Amino acid sequence: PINSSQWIANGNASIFPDKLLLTTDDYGEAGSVWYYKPVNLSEDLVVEFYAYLGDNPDGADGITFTLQSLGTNELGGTGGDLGYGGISPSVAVEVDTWLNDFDAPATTDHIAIDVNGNINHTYNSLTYPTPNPYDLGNVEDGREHLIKIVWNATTKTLQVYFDGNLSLTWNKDITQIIGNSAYFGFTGGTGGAKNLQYVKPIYVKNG
Ligand SMILES: OC[C@H]1O[C@@H](O)[C@@H](O)[C@@H](O)[C@@H]1O
Ligand SMILES: [Ca+2]
Ligand SMILES: [Mn+2]
């Protein structure tokens, strides 16, 4: 179901016939996979994918869905950077499976909106501002989780659904951060803790 010609893998990521592998269950990884054609953010964007965050609750570090207006070679930091930290201009939806000091006020595995490659939730909330991170409890349960991301180019809003539950919303015009055109894709990291991490894209609709 994955057409490998449509995806560009960087770092420790690999394109498989049925999934986008972001990290293997090994230390110090960063992986990214970008879709080959940019989307037009003056139209709506809906992305649905299954995410797998591993089977070890004591593992790390998490994944993102990222919109960024650079290109298909971008790869952010390892570990708590989730393969995303440093990429700008960007907006990311992180699924974060390791509590770093900069993750306050999160208390569990969490989903959050990050901007321009910043993964510090207090900084982003003081600067942009982004919403607080949303605690999911443990998502390193060896199950695939359904994530749906909705950009509405009329209302200038973003919604994020996890396992069918509205988890985050945002009222910032993301085109004023990244421009009207962006690559989309996925990133993952591991550090001093680890997990197998992958996504299975289901549906992408632009307009
Ligand atoms: O992997 C979990 C964590 O491990 C620590 O040793 C560092 O690698 C952090 O960057 C990382 O978030
Ligand atoms: Ca983290
Ligand atoms: Mn986080």
Swiss-Prot record:
It is found in: Membrane. It comes from the Archaea. This is Uncharacterized protein MJ1396. It comes from Methanocaldococcus jannaschii (strain ATCC 43067 / DSM 2661 / JAL-1 / JCM 10045 / NBRC 100440) (Methanococcus jannaschii). The lineage of its organism: Archaea, Methanobacteriati, Methanobacteriota, Methanomada group, Methanococci.
